[PDB]
Design a protein around this ligand. Structure first.
Ligand SMILES: OC[C@H]1O[C@@](CO)(O[C@H]2O[C@H](CO)[C@@H](O)[C@H](O)[C@H]2O)[C@@H](O)[C@@H]1O
Ligand SMILES: OC[C@H]1O[C@@](CO)(O[C@H]2O[C@H](CO)[C@@H](O)[C@H](O)[C@H]2O)[C@@H](O)[C@@H]1O
Ligand code: NA
Ligand code: NA
Lengths: 275, 275
């Protein structure tokens, strides 16, 4: 029981820190040393990380983000059992790949918001909304939602490449500056980090949350229940997906026996105060 | 420009995630691949990590926590230039070691609290307060403070091995349960994670923060200004200490030239709302 690598886009995203922690504590119990690297969405960084597996510095790798699927596939095919992909909205041939139903969860969350009476929506993404991007199952869900309700997408209320609370502060400051009749009713943030920042700037401008603008988080990160306006958010089952990923790696490594069990990884809407 | 390891106690501590991120972005710019491991205070995990340097899997290591100084010293002496220690309240012979003045900062923060009128203090530590522990410069500062003001230490208001927001919730629930005359005036939490949890439980019990109980954070983590009651806290200069650590590693590796400059790493009290 050797060295395992975990790859994520950004360790200061509490979702990824928490996912790492749950994987690492289990793998550690099994005798492995686990190390994490971050990519900042650079395919070169992914490729460099994978060279560690190719050179057998690592026994195995868990990727919780993927930049170049075809590159990951070639490595997985050369190293059967040693590459696991978790929650990256992709199935990589040659790697056991765990996908969660983010499209569904996003539709469900948007539906919740529509049902509270909201009609003018702002949509925030960590990707470039116009092109191919991470979190595009979610973007499609948003577009499908709007079409299903015959809601015109306001291009001025779309915000791409927004990741952090500080970036969310900038979004929220812009939204707070708007005249009530062009202000959104609700903001789908795609991230609890972003949501905390958005809400802070709204509140600083005496915009009421949720009465004036409802704010939907994503992930149910550790700080979410503790936020100034406790976050309504989409809960990701961090502990369960970590256990699943870990097991699929350990099985591939010949460590663990197959289980008949297969608990399903569920996203759930967590209603608090912000929406 | 090869592989660098960073060692911390816990990646879900936002202080360590942020310190890692600042180190990693700089080292990445210099062509290195950086990976982080967590120890959970297990000396075995530290020793295993150091074997990576001993076997030349890694070019160098930055430790932001230290479990067994004498073990780290033996490695540093065998691998000159390749071990840097940052903000671990220890100078390790053979490793460039950066120490920040936590005793001073702690005294200063406690003094701030005394000056606001507080007299009955609760003290929380991530260590076992009675024995040798991480963060013991801070514990000594606390004891020295109390002695300097002839304040009797209440053993019932000392809380050890408290790290997370959930643990802080438990502390805060206990404190909120107390009759006003044995309730503390102020709580020194040693951690913004702990402080968020403490405050949440106080507020849940209609205890006023800071009017009934003032809560002092530590670190000035990303969420601190965004907390329900924005945290008064001790600010650690994460970006500056990361740059310093990185430079001392790169110098040791023969990458970088010596600088005459040497900006001093300052802790500062950040006053917000919670105290
Ligand atoms: O760090 C945010 C950035 O990471 C990606 C993957 O590269 O998504 C991750 O972060 C989201 C927000 O915390 C999670 O909801 C998602 O499950 C996770 O993979 C990007 O899509 C995002 O912009
Ligand atoms: O994770 C908390 C735990 O880490 C230690 C070092 O092992 O201290 C770190 O965390 C503190 C709280 O965030 C920081 O103030 C400190 O600078 C940092 O080294 C323990 O002392 C603490 O219990
Ligand atoms: Na409204
Ligand atoms: Na008081």
């Amino acid at each position: 029981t050797g060295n395992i690598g975990v790859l994520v886009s950004r360790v200061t995203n509490p979702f990824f820190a928490g996912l790492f922690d749950a994987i690492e504590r289990e793998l550690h119990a099994h005798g492995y040393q686990v190390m994490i690297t971050q990519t900042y969405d650079d395919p070169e960084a992914e490729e460099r990380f994978l060279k560690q597996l190719k050179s057998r510095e690592l026994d195995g790798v868990i990727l919780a983000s993927v930049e170049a699927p075809d590159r990951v596939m070639a490595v997985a095919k050369a190293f059967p059992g040693r590459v696991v992909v978790v929650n990256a909205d992709v199935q990589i041939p040659g790697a056991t790949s765990l996908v969660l139903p983010h499209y569904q969860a996003t539709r469900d969350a948007l539906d919740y918001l529509f049902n509270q009476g909201h009609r003018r929506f702002a949509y925030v993404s960590g990707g470039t909304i116009s092109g191919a991007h991470h979190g595009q199952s979610r973007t499609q869900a948003f577009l499908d939602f709007m079409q299903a309700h015959q809601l015109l997408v306001a291009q001025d209320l779309l915000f791409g490449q927004i990741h952090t609370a500080k970036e969310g502060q900038a979004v929220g400051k812009q939204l707070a500056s708007l005249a009530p009749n062009v202000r959104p009713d609700a903001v789908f943030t795609n991230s609890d980090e972003v949501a905390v920042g958005v809400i802070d700037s709204l509140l600083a401008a005496d915009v009421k949350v949720p009465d004036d603008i409802a704010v939907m988080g994503y992930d149910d990160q550790p700080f979410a229940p503790f936020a100034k306006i406790p976050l309504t958010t989409v809960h990701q089952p961090v502990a369960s997906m970590a256990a699943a990923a870990t097991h699929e790696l350990l099985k591939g490594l010949g460590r663990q026996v197959a289980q008949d069990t297969q608990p399903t990884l569920h996203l759930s809407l967590k209603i608090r105060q912000s929406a």
